[PDB]
Amino acid sequence: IIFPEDFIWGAATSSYQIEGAFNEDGKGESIWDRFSHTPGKIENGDTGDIACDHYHLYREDIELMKEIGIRSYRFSTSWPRILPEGKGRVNQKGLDFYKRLVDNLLKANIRPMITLYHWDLPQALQDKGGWTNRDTAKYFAEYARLMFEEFNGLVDLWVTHNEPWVVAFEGHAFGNHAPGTKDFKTALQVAHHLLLSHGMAVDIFREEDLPGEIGITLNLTPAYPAGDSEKDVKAASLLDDYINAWFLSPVFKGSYPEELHHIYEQNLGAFTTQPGDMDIISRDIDFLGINYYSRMVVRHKPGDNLFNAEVVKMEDRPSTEMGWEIYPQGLYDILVRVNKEYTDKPLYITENGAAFDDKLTEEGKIHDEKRINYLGDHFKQAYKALKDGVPLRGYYVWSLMDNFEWAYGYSKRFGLIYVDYENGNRRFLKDSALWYREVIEKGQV
Numbered sequence: 337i338i339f340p341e342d343f344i345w346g347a348a349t350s351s352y353q354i355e356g357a358f359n360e361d362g363k364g365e366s367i368w369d370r371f372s373h374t375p376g377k378i379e380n381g382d383t384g385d386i387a388c389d390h391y392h393l394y395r396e397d398i399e400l401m402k403e404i405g406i407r408s409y410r411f412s413t414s415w416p417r418i419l420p421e422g423k424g425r426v427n428q429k430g431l432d433f434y435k436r437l438v439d440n441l442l443k444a445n446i447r448p449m450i451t452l453y454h455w456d457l458p459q460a461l462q463d464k465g466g467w468t469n470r471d472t473a474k475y476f477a478e479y480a481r482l483m484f485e486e487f488n489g490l491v492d493l494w495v496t497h498n499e500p501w502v503v504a505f506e507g508h509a510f511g512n513h514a515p516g517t518k519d520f521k522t523a524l525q526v527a528h529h530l531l532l533s534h535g536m537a538v539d540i541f542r543e544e545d546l547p548g549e550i551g552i553t554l555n556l557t558p559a560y561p562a563g564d565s566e567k568d569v570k571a572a573s574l575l576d577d578y579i580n581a582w583f584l585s586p587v588f589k590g591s592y593p594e595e596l597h598h599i600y601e602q603n604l605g606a607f608t609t610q611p612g613d614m615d616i617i618s619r620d621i622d623f624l625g626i627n628y629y630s631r632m633v634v635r636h637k638p639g640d641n642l643f644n645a646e647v648v649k650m651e652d653r654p655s656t657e658m659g660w661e662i663y664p665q666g667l668y669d670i671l672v673r674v675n676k677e678y679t680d681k682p683l684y685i686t687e688n689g690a691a692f693d694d695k696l697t698e699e700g701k702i703h704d705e706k707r708i709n710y711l712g713d714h715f716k717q718a719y720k721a722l723k724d725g726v727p728l729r730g731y732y733v734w735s736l737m738d739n740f741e742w743a744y745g746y747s748k749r750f751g752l753i754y755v756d757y758e759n760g761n762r763r764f765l766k767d768s769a770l771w772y773r774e775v776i777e778k779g780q781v
């Protein structure tokens with residue numbers, strides 16, 4: 337098992353999950369500032385106020401990146417740190433932080449990949465309806481243009497959006513994520529505008545003529561029938577469209593999946609679109625980012641919901657601390673399917689990783705063998721996909737460091753690096769980081 341010597345091994349983070357400095361240097365409020373400061377939304381009342389304090393500690397963090405030897409670092413930029421009101425006047429100190437960060441990465445021979453939207457919408461824009469207001473799509477594109485202009489010739493890997501399914505449905509249907517709305521109709525309208533805003537930024541990227549590549553990042557969860565039933569097969573197919581095709585088809589085919597679109601429209605009524613929207617959404621892009629963690633096993637169940645389907649708990653299979661099934665085969669299956677059905681463009685795994693109950697020992701080590709076994713098994717499936725002709729160019733581990741795991745707060749640790757929050761926010765390389773270091777040196781698992 338040996339990867340190409342130029343294969344792009346990396347690690348990933350996001351702004352709200354690591355930066356801290358939540359109201360420092362003119363930064364505006366985000367929907368995740370607001371949400372986490374709302375009682376009962378986050379486990380243990382955790383907030384991202386300080387988190388890993390990467391905003392002040394980023395130089396030390398880049399030293400640790402160099403120790404592991406990652407070739408690329410995927411991070412997101414905070415829209416409200418740069419444009420506090422979401423539009424209007426740039427906050428120069430906020431922008432200067434990312435200019436310093438990128439200069440330091442380039443000096444370290446670490447190739448940056450910027451995610452423009454990793455969920456921290458300006459609260460100023462949420463007060464005008466957030467993603468149900470089509471203007472939010474326009475202002476996102478304007479923010480994209482600013483960033484393209486400022487990092488022309490410095491950043492050549494760009495992702496518009498991280499996981500629009502999650503933003504739409506966890507954020508607005510089930511209310512587990514900011515802004516915390518619980519209305520499925522709103523979630524559909526949101527999804528459309530996220531997709532729209534993506535295409536709008538792609539158009540601007542081409543016009544600005546920067547050197548480099550632009551794409552989008554989707555969480556993809558492959559679905560499997562619980563049984564041989566032709567009804568279990570249709571059920572899994574529908575849930576596969578719910579999560580995956582709902583965003584894959586618009587981006588690569590210029591249409592929503594037909595049956596599911598019908599089902600939604602019949603029960604909820606139509607969400608608002610303008611003519612030509614599917615043309616914008618489906619602009620040609622340069623790569624697809626895939627975030628993969630697990631699968632879903634699905635059985636038919638007429639009653640409970642709109643898809644007449646429920647997900648089966650695989651209780652006799654190993655799982656992570658999140659309760660997610662460990663299922664490395666799913667990473668191969670989804671890479672192969674995307675390449676077969678949707679696109680021949682380069683693919684990146686922009687996230688894969690796992691939470692386990694990490695214990696810091698009585699001097700500074702973390703023996704997270706479960707994480708080593710998890711990543712190893714998934715690296716092997718990526719290799720198999722490669723060998724079978726999938727144009728996989730890179731693999732980013734989630735995460736470079738322990739961080740704020742959204743509604744779970746700091747209770748869930750995904751890092752290669754342990755963050756000892758209470759003790760000066762000090763960092764410790766886990767065994768999995770030492771392991772990943774060996775993999776990258778050799779290009780061999």
Ligand SMILES: OC[C@H]1O[C@@H](O)[C@H](O)[C@@H](O)[C@@H]1O
Pocket residue numbers: 350353498499555627687734741742750
């Ligand atoms: O759940 C762990 C990670 O999963 C991915 O889907 C998200 O993009 C990350 O922000 C998240 O922390």
Ligand SMILES: C[As](C)(=O)[O-]
Pocket residue numbers: 588589590591614615618
């Ligand atoms: C992606 As098209 C040309 O069918 O709108």
